[PDB]
């Protein structure tokens, strides 16, 4: 009996239509580092210019890094105000925590702030938020933050995602794709706020995992706003998200770690992760597509996770891309750095306004089916097959 | 065009019902602590047999505490191997992160086998995995170590969510409740493991809400099967999850804190939240149910957030309950203590239990209405709305 309410109640709460993008908002920490210039910053305040061969090591993986700048929160003035950060293995995870706790959910306010004046709602219309950042775990956490810097409703359904990995920038679009769909008027915020300052450490010689992130890592945050059933007045679809699918490739659980400890974050990183991904792609994107009758994957715009330029170059090769198609992906890495789950969004953005400067027939280069491929530790790859829209 | 195909996908992977919970299985830790036995435990292996003053205090909370028992992983055994647990502020974190880490997914891995061992079905037909921890974060974290722990599929949706709070009793369920309403077969498997090892301090009367603490919190792992259009054979519906709402009472951010630092988690808890909670509970169950004409606070069947006595009563006291309505989650604080998230779920397999035991017409107690309230740091109150099944 009461069976029929819940079944009426469930039926009117559906959407119509699909999840869409309806905005996309990006921000970063105001200080650049111009990668020719961070071998030099980076081995003198940390007190290591003896580190000869180490830091000809990190000279030339700065050079093959295809990053030309950076912004990070991690300034001189906060390396001298924190000389704990400049000793290997020192106690610091309570100074990093104190700078991460306030400038995650502001980072993240100035990304949304900009999703929310191109998107033109009021906040009121905020349903759902979903909150994900690579470190600062704290209680209550960065979602809540946000929701009083911003002042949404009290009533909306915030989600907290701290330190889930990379992927997650695909993860969280599915999960907004659902409560978008599974509730009509839904609007969902989703907002990546990633600081990377659990990562600076002292180079060491027995620590070498640590170049390698220290050459990529950048800050940034992006905002996304998720919603099916668009008023066709003011809201403006810039894609639809379509179909997402999760990985985690068997064995390959340590290829990348990082443990939050005193001292930090202590970070491993598989010289094999590009390598491995490279093996897996064709097989994920073929089975992503089963369902849409897609076969030529140069007919696909993409937004691939920088994680760095031997992944672009892996998923480019493996796929048998033009060497055009992650022009926008490697723009990103250039211009930001690797700025973990929010890349892809700078990435989508990025391939927006190039089609419109382009005067393109789509949001999507002109091409109506794309793929966002969101990469993380596990490994794990979500996969989510977007549909542009024409402008 | 390709929206034709688009919108025929989804509307095939939506389901017909709604979302139910299929199976519950809990576990605890190993050794038994009774609360008459704990203010001496608890200052000897801290080495503060001298507090005779704050002892008594302690010993009067916990005569106080309506907690009979709990089931703790902080042995004497941990506490020699790891002696900077027990002196005040001295760094050891790393030390708990290490317990946490194994802990954490192996306690989840019990809850979650006792609930797939009732729920019947193969590991495979799980699509979706959502962890929630209270504390242990890790890349990659507890869900890929349960997946690894379990035999799950690789391309099982994982989410990963480290101390959110605990409102993510009731939160957690309702992003099932999507995952499995826009997902026609998906099954979730939703598992709190909640280790309280990083509140765990030597007594101090500078810091008496940790004592409050250190007489509820007890470790505990729920698992819960959640799934739309069950096969109506051979998987059987607990209960109906038909409605969830939110509600982050404005100008409370305070009231419950929990900062992750070097000497583990710092905690305050004011004295003043069973007291809000009592205040904002007949709105919040009032707002929740409006779609479905329920004004009868008896009619219902209750789980709630066992955070502590005071809550209870104050629960109790402002829905105007019979003092027999309490009875599954008193129990559950008697013989497992404040369990965070997964406290809920004990309480729901109580429940059910008692009710296929006294013979009910329902598994709710008889009664069709029920009400579950997750209640954590923010303040933050999620109302989950469910509906009995016959029996």
Redesign the interface.
């Known amino acids: 009996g ?2 029929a ?3 009426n ?2 039926n009117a709460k ?1 959407s119509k ?2 999840a869409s993008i309806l905005a996309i908002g990006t921000a970063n920490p105001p200080t650049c580092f111009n990668q020719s210039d961070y071998p030099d910053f980076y081995f003198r305040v940390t007190d290591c210019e003896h580190k000869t061969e180490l830091k000809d090591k990190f000279k030339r993986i700065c050079d093959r890094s295809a990053v030309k700048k950076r912004y990070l929160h991690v300034t001189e003035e906060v390396l001298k105000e924190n000389p704990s950060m400049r000793s290997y293995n020192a ?1 610091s ?2 100074a990093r ?1 104190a700078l991460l ?1 306030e400038q995650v959910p502001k980072l993240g306010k100035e990304a949304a702030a900009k999703a929310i004046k191109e998107w033109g709602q009021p906040l009121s219309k905020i349903t759902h938020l979903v909150f994900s950042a690579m470190a600062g ?5 960065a979602d ?1 933050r946000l ?2 810097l911003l002042g949404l409703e ?12 990379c992927f997650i920038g695909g ?1 969280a679009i ?2 907004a ?3 978008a ?3 009509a008027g839904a609007r969902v915020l989703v907002v990546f706020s990633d600081i990377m300052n659990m990562y600076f450490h002292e180079p060491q010689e027995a620590h070498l995992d640590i170049l390698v992130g220290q050459a990529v890592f950048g800050d940034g945050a992006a905002a996304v706003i998720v919603g099916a059933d668009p008023e066709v007045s003011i809201e403006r679809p810039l894609f ?1 998200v ?2 997402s ?6 064995d390959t ?1 340590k290829f ?7 001292m930090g974050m202590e970070l491993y990183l598989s010289k094999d992760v590009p390598a491995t991904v490279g093996k897996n792609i064709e097989k994920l994107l073929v089975d992503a597509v089963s ?3 897609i076969s030529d994957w140069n007919s696909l715009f993409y937004s691939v996770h920088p994680g760095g330029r031997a992944i672009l170059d892996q998923v480019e090769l493996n796929l048998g891309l033009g060497k055009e198609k992650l022009r926008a992906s490697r723009h990103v890495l250039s211009e930001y750095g690797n700025m973990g789950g929010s890349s892809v969004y700078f990435i989508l953005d990025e391939i927006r306004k190039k089609s419109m400067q382009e005067a393109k027939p789509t949001t999507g280069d002109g091409l ?2 794309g793929v966002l491929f969101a990469i993380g ?2 490994l ?1 790859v979500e996969t989510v097959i977007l ?1 542009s829209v024409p402008i």
């Not at 775990?137 to 956490?141: A, E, K, L, N, T």
């Open positions: 009461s069976m309410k819940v079944k109640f469930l559906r239509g699909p106690p995870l309570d925590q706790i775990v704290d209680i209550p956490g809540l929701m009083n009290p009533s909306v359904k915030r989600l907290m995602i701290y330190s889930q990995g993860a599915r999960c794709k659902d409560f769909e599974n509730n639809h379509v179909s699918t999760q990985m985690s490739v068997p659980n990348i770690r990082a443990h939050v400890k005193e369902p849409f009758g109506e089916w530790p596990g794990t549909l």
